[PDB]
Amino acid sequence: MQDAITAVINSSDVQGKYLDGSAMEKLKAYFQTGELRVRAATTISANAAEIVKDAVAKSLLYSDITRPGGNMYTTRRYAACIRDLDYYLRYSTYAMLAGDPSILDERVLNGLKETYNSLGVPVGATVQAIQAMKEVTATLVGADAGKEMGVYFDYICSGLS
Amino acid sequence: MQDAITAVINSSDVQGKYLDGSAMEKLKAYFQTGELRVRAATTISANAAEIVKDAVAKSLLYSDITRPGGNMYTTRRYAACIRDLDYYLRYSTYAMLAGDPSILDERVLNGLKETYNSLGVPVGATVQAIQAMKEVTATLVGADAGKEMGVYFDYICSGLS
Amino acid sequence: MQDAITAVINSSDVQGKYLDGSAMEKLKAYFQTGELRVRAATTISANAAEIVKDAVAKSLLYSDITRPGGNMYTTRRYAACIRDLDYYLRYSTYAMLAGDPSILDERVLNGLKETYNSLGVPVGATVQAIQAMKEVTATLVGADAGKEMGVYFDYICSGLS
Amino acid sequence: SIVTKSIVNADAEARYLSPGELDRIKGFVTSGERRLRIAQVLTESRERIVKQAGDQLFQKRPDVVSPGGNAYGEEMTATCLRDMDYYLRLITYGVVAGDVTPIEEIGLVGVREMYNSLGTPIPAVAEAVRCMKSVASSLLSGEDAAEAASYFDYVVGAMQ
Amino acid sequence: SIVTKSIVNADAEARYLSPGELDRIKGFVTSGERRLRIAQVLTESRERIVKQAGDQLFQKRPDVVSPGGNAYGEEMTATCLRDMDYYLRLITYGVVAGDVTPIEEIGLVGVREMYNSLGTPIPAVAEAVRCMKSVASSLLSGEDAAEAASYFDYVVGAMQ
Amino acid sequence: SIVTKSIVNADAEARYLSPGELDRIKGFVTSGERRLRIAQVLTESRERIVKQAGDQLFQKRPDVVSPGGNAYGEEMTATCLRDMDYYLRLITYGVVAGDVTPIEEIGLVGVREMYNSLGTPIPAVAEAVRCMKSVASSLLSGEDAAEAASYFDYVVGAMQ
Ligand SMILES: *[C@H](C)[C@H]1/C(=C/c2[nH]c(/C=C3N=C(/C=C4\NC(=O)C(CC)=C4C)C(C)=C\3CCC(=O)O)c(CCC(=O)O)c2C)NC(=O)[C@@H]1C
Ligand SMILES: *[C@H](C)[C@H]1/C(=C/c2[nH]c(/C=C3N=C(/C=C4\NC(=O)C(CC)=C4C)C(C)=C\3CCC(=O)O)c(CCC(=O)O)c2C)NC(=O)[C@@H]1C
Ligand SMILES: *[C@H](C)[C@H]1/C(=C/c2[nH]c(/C=C3N=C(/C=C4\NC(=O)C(CC)=C4C)C(C)=C\3CCC(=O)O)c(CCC(=O)O)c2C)NC(=O)[C@@H]1C
Ligand SMILES: *[C@H](C)[C@H]1/C(=C/c2[nH]c(/C=C3N=C(/C=C4\NC(=O)C(CC)=C4C)C(C)=C\3CCC(=O)O)c(CCC(=O)O)c2C)NC(=O)[C@@H]1C
Ligand SMILES: *[C@H](C)[C@H]1/C(=C/c2[nH]c(/C=C3N=C(/C=C4\NC(=O)C(CC)=C4C)C(C)=C\3CCC(=O)O)c(CCC(=O)O)c2C)NC(=O)[C@@H]1C
Ligand SMILES: *[C@H](C)[C@H]1/C(=C/c2[nH]c(/C=C3N=C(/C=C4\NC(=O)C(CC)=C4C)C(C)=C\3CCC(=O)O)c(CCC(=O)O)c2C)NC(=O)[C@@H]1C
């Protein structure tokens, strides 16, 4: 994976260049966002269970999904599903700290879409849940952090389609 | 895998229903066939070597298959082939006891057709052998059990094409 | 893998035939080339580092390949590349001793082309290097051995396209 | 079912079933009639079993149906009873199959993660099963009640 | 061949062949002429070797050619001799290659499963090879007979 | 960066970052300004650092620039200096990132195999880095020189 710093490095390395004004300015941008990123990560860590609890209630419960014949039916599949949500939240949080989505491509999205098709996991429904988690998270961490977290929730969704 | 009982359960579970008249009747059907299934399995276990021996003599020997250039040529390939036949007989016997073919899909047929193509295993010839084993088995276990065993021998053949 | 001897055997075995005049003559051909093969293998073993060193200087260095953005850029990729060359040289040498290329198909070329595409390894450039190594080797081991080594260098190249 | 389980064992040892496995299956299909009757009673009286057990449950655990409780109000109480009906259903599955496996695979694997998430008090759910066990047992012979007991108990002891 | 075997060794250790391996191959191709001559004799006299060995075999083991035996009757006796010819052939393969590997890969791997299935008495097959060894050896020098002995013996000791 | 490294750790333990990891990152972005300034100085004076270090290097190691040496002649000397500039560049990468990882991944992994192949004397390359360290350090405060020292030293101690 990359974070915002090492990404800039590889961009300058690929060109065999020292860090110029633009590169230095991007690094500065990132450092200045540093503390807000940590603070938001602390908040999300602290409510991780409830964020997923709210996101599930809001988008999945009392539907066909959770009834006999739905993909969330049987306790094993219910657990699997909210386990996926913990994943998406935790890696979204990583990506947010890092200020770069490469960890999502690397450890979350790789062959995920194909897996979901294979088992019958409803992608559209999954995405509704993530988008719900985005709103719940935003409410919790504020507008600025919520926007940034949103970048990565969205990144995940796009990878699923 | 499923057996005849757990298959019925999943059918009723998928619908979120208790066991109704049809479901109960299928379970009854299965229990009533129970002892005949065990008896036939005891007989097949007891002659497993000779069933394959007869099936091979009847359908494969003294042909191009067993001569230099055939797929049964070299002792390693001869052993491989009759080893496949022991497999088909033993799992057919499982499926018969279970009154359900899901074990064939699960542990026998998965990627089998592709494997056989890959190594040059003659599928048509393989199927002749299995169909021969069916006749040999039928002779041995009687008409009713032979019919049932036949269900699974056939199931395997269909999976090979 | 096969060597020149076991290849002839399998050809006669496939036909269920004893070794006839042609088969015996091929075996003889091989034995008579035996010592020249060992001698050339001793020479190549003895200069293996310099052969690759020369082949690299001749075909890859001071180009875009070794500059920032090239596939040989970063010391890890430079090492990887000349490591590939050691491989091609060592297996070419095996194939030469064996008087048969089956080891190249078996342990070198299997899924290689697909791998190279996957990582971005330049195939054309790789082949230039191997063809350079051929010339360097030829210079070193003489015309006859060089021709034979050439058979296998070429075999590798063809497998890459 | 012992039929699946035996087959799985035999397969992992690359062999036909053992004479004992075969005999085991023989005694299993023999008892098929009896277990079907037990499931049938529980099926037929499901509405009573779940209603009465629910009433007993809410006596033992008024907290869950009082404000602040996971089953507070008509809709949440109804969902609770809905869940109880789920487990009575699964238990009838287990009874015909001869073991607790369909209960496990449908209703216990990850049950902790599900109910934790929802904030449902899991010990109160265990208690609800006890209550159903109590009501169910009375509609059965001493023999059948004993046999059915092991299915209810397993659910209760696995509600963790 | 020692050539393949050396290469396989060297490859597993990510290295060129050792001076000893190389020297080994050198002595191997040097003896190529001699081993070819030995295979050539066995090739040329194959029909005699298999016929006489078959006759000796059926003296030592009349059970296999009497009623109830695996080689009873003209056709089964002919198939038996057919098999013997198979193994004489494989042995000539081994001789030119310098080791028993082509014998193993073509005719010994799973030979037990094949012959058990057919109900062919495997010790009688071993005996048949002994018989071919006996006949073959007489057509060779003391030197060549000794060298060829190891191939026949290996087949006999691996007939299990 | 400690940010990547922390994340990788946390991920391998299936957890969010620890309060300490988080605090570590907080102190890391806090020192961002300082490390950027250090990289900026080395960037700005790169041509001097590499030229003077090259001159000092060729004093300590005249063999590399005399006949028979790996950097003999204008073009080879220029390639040597080219390489030195490479490593100064990588070092500025490491400085902003807070650790030696970009140096490792770009310029040390397999560096031995590369330079051995080329016949470049690796200890003389280490010395060249020492020389750049010397020149670079003088353009920095005692504080910044100390901090930058660890990056140069790591390269030198990893030049094996
Ligand atoms: C929940 C919102 C939705 C849902 C989920 C669901 N997923 C599965 C199965 C899998 N999910 C994953 C996904 C990941 N695994 C990982 O390790 C990571 C990153 C660390 C991700 C993103 C995988 C690999 C599987 C298969 C393996 C497994 O079981 O864990 C299921 C169960 C499928 C089954 O039938 O077994 C479910 C139910 N389903 C929904 O209905 C929601 C919309
Ligand atoms: C015999 C009637 C025919 C025949 C068979 C043959 N098969 C192989 C190779 C394989 N067969 C299998 C099949 C299975 N493996 C399993 O584990 C199971 C279920 C438990 C099945 C159904 C597989 C996986 C292989 C490849 C791996 C292996 O060698 O075991 C061969 C040998 C192929 C080779 O060249 O090595 C042969 C000869 N061939 C015939 O001619 C008959 C018609
Ligand atoms: C060098 C002339 C060219 C070049 C090579 C290059 N290759 C890789 C990566 C791999 N190369 C191989 C090839 C083999 N591996 C084997 O084990 C064998 C036989 C024993 C062969 C032929 C493989 C498998 C890889 C991937 C795994 C690995 O890294 O070793 C790279 C690095 C790719 C990367 O980005 O990591 C390079 C640079 N590249 C060139 O530019 C030359 C033309
Ligand atoms: C009743 C004794 C206790 C209780 C129950 C309760 N449950 C819920 C919500 C749900 N329960 C389930 C249950 C299952 N899903 C399955 O697949 C299986 C296995 C067959 C079971 C048992 C599910 C999926 C839900 C979510 C709602 C839905 O159907 O989508 C509630 C409501 C919780 C809420 O806040 O909505 C309640 C009240 N609660 C208690 O306190 C009793 C101890
Ligand atoms: C003779 C000394 C003994 C004997 C032999 C016997 N064999 C068979 C039948 C077969 N034998 C083979 C043998 C091989 N197949 C191979 O690929 C190899 C390696 C090269 C060998 C050695 C095969 C394939 C058969 C089946 C027939 C066929 O060719 O398809 C028989 C006939 C058995 C029958 O009942 O038909 C006999 C008699 N039997 C003895 O008793 C002697 C000790
Ligand atoms: C200078 C202090 C020493 C020295 C250097 C020297 N190097 C070369 C040739 C090359 N050096 C590289 C270096 C790198 N490639 C990378 O990707 C990285 C990491 C960023 C490094 C450091 C490469 C690729 C070459 C090959 C030439 C090319 O660019 O393609 C030479 C020339 C060798 C020759 O014979 O051509 C020299 C002289 N030599 C010394 O003696 C000094 C001690």
Residue numbers in the entry:
A (entry chain B), B (entry chain B), C (entry chain B): 1 to 161
D (entry chain A), E (entry chain A), F (entry chain A): 2 to 161
Copied sentences from the primary study:
Phycobiliproteins (PBPs) and linker proteins (LPs) are mutually arranged in cyanobacteria and red algae to form multi-molecular assemblies of around 4–8 MDa called phycobilisomes (PBS). The core invariantly contains allophycocyanin (APC, absorption λmax ~653 nm) and associated LPs. The unique red-shifted absorbances of APC chromophores and their fluorescence emission overlapping to that of chlorophyll has been found to play major connecting role in this light funneling phenomenon.
In the present paper, we report the first crystal structure of APC isolated from the marine cyanobacterium, Phormidium sp. A09DM (formerly known as Lyngbya sp. A09DM). The APC crystal belonged to space group H 32, with unit-cell parameters a = b = 101.2 Å, c = 193.0 Å. The trimer in the crystals is generated by the crystallographic symmetry. The protein is observed to exist as a trimer both in solution and in crystals. The structures of α- and β- subunits are comprised of seven α-helices adopting globin-like fold (SCOP, 46457) and their folds are identical to that of other known APC structures. Trimer formation packs the amino acid residues of β-subunit closer to α-chromophore, while atoms of β-subunit only interact with its bound chromophore. The β-subunit contributes three Tyr, three Thr and one Leu residues to the microenvironment of the α-chromophore. However, microenvironment of the PCB chromophore bound to α-subunit is enriched by hydrophobic residues, owing to the presence of Met-85 and Ala-129 residues, in the Phormidium APC protein.
